[PDB]
Amino acid sequence: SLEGKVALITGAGSGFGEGMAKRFAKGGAKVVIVDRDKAGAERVAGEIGDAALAVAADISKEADVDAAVEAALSKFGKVDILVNNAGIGHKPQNAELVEPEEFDRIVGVNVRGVYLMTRKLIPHFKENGAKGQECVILNVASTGAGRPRPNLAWYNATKGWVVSVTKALAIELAPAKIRVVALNPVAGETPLLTTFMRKKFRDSIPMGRLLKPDDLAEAAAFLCSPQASMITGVALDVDGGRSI
Numbered sequence: 370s371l372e373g374k375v376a377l378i379t380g381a382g383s384g385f386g387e388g389m390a391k392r393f394a395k396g397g398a399k400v401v402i403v404d405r406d407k408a409g410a411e412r413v414a415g416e417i418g419d420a421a422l423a424v425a426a427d428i429s430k431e432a433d434v435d436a437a438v439e440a441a442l443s444k445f446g447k448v449d450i451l452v453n454n455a456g457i458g459h460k461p462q463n464a465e466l467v468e469p470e471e472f473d474r475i476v477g478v479n480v481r482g483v484y485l486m487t488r489k490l491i492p493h494f495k496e497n498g499a500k501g502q503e504c505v506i507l508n509v510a511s512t513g514a515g516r517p518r519p520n521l522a523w524y525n526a527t528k529g530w531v532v533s534v535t536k537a538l539a540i541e542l543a544p545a546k547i548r549v550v551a552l553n554p555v556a557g558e559t560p561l562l563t564t565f566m567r568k569k570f571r572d573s574i575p576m577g578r579l580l581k582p583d584d585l586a587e588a589a590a591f592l593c594s595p596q597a598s599m600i601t602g603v604a605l606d607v608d609g610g611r612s613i
């Protein structure tokens with residue numbers, strides 16, 4: 370289904386990104402594991418096997434993004450799918466207590482990093498689309514982008530940026546045969562969950578359980594597949610009903 374495709378996934382050394390890298394590879398994709406956590410990237414890539422390449426990079430820095438893209442193209446010759454999944458947050462707290470240094474770092478990863486990775490790959494994607502090869506950008510946002518609860522204000526707003534840029538890129542890039550979509554996950558069983566924080570979260574999800582990486586990975590695999598070739602500009606909630 371993703372056979373022949375090459376997916377570059379940021380933040381794939383852990384959590385949701387790790388689940389997507391594994392699910393995509395099981396679907397026949399080559400996967401470029403881009404993460405600032407070199408040990409996690411290498412573990413995931415080694416667990417997947419020869420279809421995975423680990424790339425250590427801080428996607429908030431332009432030089433690292435240039436190097437990660439060059440590495441992906443050297444190894445696999447093309448990139449078909451970009452998954453912007455890397456992200457950081459802040460501990461829940463009153464908004465006015467997040468100081469500018471922490472605010473700036475969160476924007477650097479969740480906003481600038483998406484901008485850098487997307488901007489660097491758009492020329493390649495346009496080349497591919499001109500050859501009749503559709504490309505997909507998938508951005509991982511959050512139910513908090515449009516359905517926030519108190520105490521995660523600046524994190525949630527970066528995910529609102531992501532949902533917005535998904536729409537804006539989608540309408541601009543559709544004639545180039547590039548689709549741009551987003552996923553809005555609810556609280557998931559990843560290492561980052563203790564930062565945004567379990568019975569209280571579970572009971573707030575109408576379907577009655579937390580999201581697991583495998584759940585989100587299936588929606589990502591569908592949206593990045595040719596079976597979704599007319600789906601673009603959407604932000605799909607994968608949340609057990611939390612956003613209703």
Ligand SMILES: NC(=O)C1=CN([C@@H]2O[C@H](COP(=O)(O)OP(=O)(O)OC[C@H]3O[C@@H](n4cnc5c(N)ncnc54)[C@H](O)[C@@H]3O)[C@@H](O)[C@H]2O)C=CC1
Binds near residue numbers: 478557
């Ligand atoms: N876990 C949850 O409850 C929810 C998470 N999200 C978003 O899902 C996405 C994946 O997060 P999780 O898997 O849960 O957390 P995670 O911490 O397990 O995985 C995030 C990975 O991105 C990497 N990362 C952070 N900054 C980076 C940078 N400059 N450059 C390269 N890699 C960087 C991290 O090293 C990490 O391996 C994130 O964007 C997160 O904001 C959205 C709402 C719910």
